[PDB]
Design a protein around this ligand. Structure first.
Ligand SMILES: CC(=O)N[C@@H]1[C@@H](O)[C@H](O)[C@@H](CO)O[C@H]1O
Ligand SMILES: [Ca+2]
Length: 220
């Protein structure tokens, strides 16, 4: 019955954690276990990505198209939900995406983008995002309207292979201002922009230790 975490919240469940949901497209992707953040600004957020120090290698997110398509990781630790699943959820209705970022000093920033959705695999999971708001700085905006790229599939608009240079699966442009699926370098680093970066806040030489991407219906 519940199609996402907002529905789960409206049904009375107030605690954060894993829940089974029935997206409207369950006939194809099936039911899914998702992590629901029921605390941030009222709750009802379905988490689609998370980075943290959970024991996985620093290059854990350095995976090919197939892995990003199907998803990988544990929803209670660091993971990527899966593009087919993200497509299924973002298309069942209108969602906004929220980015929660935290640095090593435990300070935090967030960014909200309305009308968040991606197209299906045939269209290379092209990204769509609306207006920005928040205090982290608008570093995801430049990615609007770009294809998804991975180490084995260059779909960006640069002469080089953005994914191989910056190490993640992302909607690379030429190449990025945000790189949340990059290497887990934990803090300051000399290498150039290949860690978990959010340019508008910490520049290109600081890999955020903890980040999360989560969605909630606009009509919440
Ligand atoms: C990590 C990254 O993509 N840095 C690019 C830089 O290579 C490019 O020359 C410049 C053009 O303005 O824009 C930056 O955002
Ligand atoms: Ca290229």
């Amino acid at each position: 019955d519940p199609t996402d975490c907002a529905d789960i919240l409206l049904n009375g469940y107030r605690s954060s954690g894993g829940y089974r949901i029935w997206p409207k497209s369950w006939m194809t992707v099936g039911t899914l276990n998702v992590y629901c953040d029921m605390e941030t600004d009222g709750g009802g957020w379905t988490v689609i990505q998370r980075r943290g120090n959970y024991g996985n290698p620093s290059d854990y997110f350095y995976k090919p198209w197939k892995n990003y398509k199907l998803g990988f990781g544990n929803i209670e630790k660091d993971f990527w939900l899966g593009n087919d699943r993200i497509f299924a959820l973002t298309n069942q209705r209108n969602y906004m995406i929220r980015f929660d970022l935290k640095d090593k000093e435990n300070d935090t920033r967030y960014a909200i983008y309305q009308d968040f959705w991606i197209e299906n695999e045939d269209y290379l999971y092209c990204l769509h995002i609306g207006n920005y708001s928040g205090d982290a700085g608008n570093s995801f905006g430049r990615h609007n309207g770009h294809n998804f790229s991975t180490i084995d599939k260059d779909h960006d608009t640069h002469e080089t292979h953005c994914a191989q240079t910056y190490k993640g699966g992302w909607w690379y442009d030429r190449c990025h201002e945000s790189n949340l699926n990059g290497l887990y370098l934990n803090g300051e680093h000399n290498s150039y922009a290949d860690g978990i970066e959010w340019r508008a806040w910490k520049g290109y030489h600081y890999s955020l230790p903890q980040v999360e991407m989560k969605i909630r219906p606009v009509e919440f």
